[PDB]
Amino acid sequence: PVPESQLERWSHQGATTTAKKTHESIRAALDRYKWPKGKPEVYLQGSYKNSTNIRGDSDVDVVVQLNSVFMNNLTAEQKRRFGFVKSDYTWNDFYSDVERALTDYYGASKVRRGRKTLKVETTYLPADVVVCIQYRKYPPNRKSEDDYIEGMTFYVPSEDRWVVNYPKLHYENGAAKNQQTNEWYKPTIRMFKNARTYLIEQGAPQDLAPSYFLECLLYNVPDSKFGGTFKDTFCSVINWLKRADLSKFRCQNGQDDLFGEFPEQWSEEKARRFLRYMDDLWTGWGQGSHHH
Ligand SMILES: Nc1ncnc2c1ncn2[C@@H]1O[C@H](COP(=O)(O)CP(=O)(O)OP(=O)(O)O)[C@@H](O)[C@H]1O
Numbered sequence: 001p002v003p004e005s006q007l008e009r010w011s012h013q014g015a016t017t018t019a020k021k022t023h024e025s026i027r028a029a030l031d032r033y034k035w036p037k038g039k040p041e042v043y044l045q046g047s048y049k050n051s052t053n054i055r056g057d058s059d060v061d062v063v064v065q066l067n068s069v070f071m072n073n074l075t076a077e078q079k080r081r082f083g084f085v086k087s088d089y090t091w092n093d094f095y096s097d098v099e100r101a102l103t104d105y106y107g108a109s110k111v112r113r114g115r116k117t118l119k120v121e122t123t124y125l126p127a128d129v130v131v132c133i134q135y136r137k138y139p140p141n142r143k144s145e146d147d148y149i150e151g152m153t154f155y156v157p158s159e160d161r162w163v164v165n166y167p168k169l170h171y172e173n174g175a176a177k178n179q180q181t182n183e184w185y186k187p188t189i190r191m192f193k194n195a196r197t198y199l200i201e202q203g204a205p206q207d208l209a210p211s212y213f214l215e216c217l218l219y220n221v222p223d224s225k226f227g228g229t230f231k232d233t234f235c236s237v238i239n240w241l242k243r244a245d246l247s248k249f250r251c252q253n254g255q256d257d258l259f260g261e262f263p264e265q266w267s268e269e270k271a272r273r274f275l276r277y278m279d280d281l282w283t284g285w286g287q288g289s290h291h292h
């Protein structure tokens, strides 16, 4: 087993002050721009937003979301029934406006286009800025204009595909679980993140447990497994996961399946590998060996 004080150290949160100033910096850049078709909202997502950052110097995940228009899953007839009209302002236009705003503020050398994000070197931390449009997921019987689930969506030009995320729901649901576990959920995420990273530093696979997938995996664990001590939490969580049916796990946003064939999803075999390494870490810590 792993000593409690070691697990408790692994549960510590990295500083967030520099990350908040990174967020405030991006927001100030966009506040200075003259927006032709709606001013986007700017919020954080990722570990800093969810209080699961294990360092204070990791990249800041920023969402820049246009809400004056929305993409959706409606058919043309359903859009008509709701009185929606086509926006002539596209995701591409909005992206170009966001990029111009950031470039005007930080300088061209500090703003560059990534695969899925605009990457910005601020005077604080690097920011990964997701430029997205509000997404409305309507139910299969589409009857009322207000009955939808809100996410966001963005285009990936190098892959000719659209991504739909639900970061606000990811945050809301993680906070709710943290409330209901008497605040053990987020420290437990960080404990496992630091345990994973400790193993990666010693030579374990780089993709042993990508942070987002690890949060989603732990989100599916019953609240009763979190609490008491970190030692009891480590074992109760891991022992439950070893016996669980992973196939029906949902992401923390409550909408998507965690495991599947799409590029946003994980695989059960990778999840099982993570559990094996945590098992070995636990049983391996206090044990002596010798050559056979
Ligand atoms: N496969 C994926 N599917 C849906 N959303 C994803 C995603 N990967 C990343 N994201 C979104 O981008 C956010 C930040 O991505 P990452 O930085 O890779 C995870 P993180 O929680 O910030 O851990 P970190 O502390 O190692 O940075 C995630 O919290 C999520 O909102």
Ligand SMILES: O=c1ccn([C@@H]2O[C@H](COP(=O)(O)NP(=O)(O)OP(=O)(O)O)[C@@H](O)[C@H]2O)c(=O)[nH]1
Residues within 6 Å of the ligand: 046, 061, 062, 114, 115, 116, 117, 128, 130, 163, 165, 264
């Ligand atoms: O579904 C997603 C995937 C990714 N992201 C955000 O995109 C960033 C990169 O996501 P990524 O590292 O998984 N993809 P990558 O090929 O490295 O593209 P890029 O790094 O942009 O050149 C991540 O750090 C997230 O902040 C989302 O917001 N939603």
Ligand SMILES: [Mg+2]
Residues within 6 Å of the ligand: 046, 047, 048, 058, 059, 060, 061
């Ligand atoms: Mg992050």
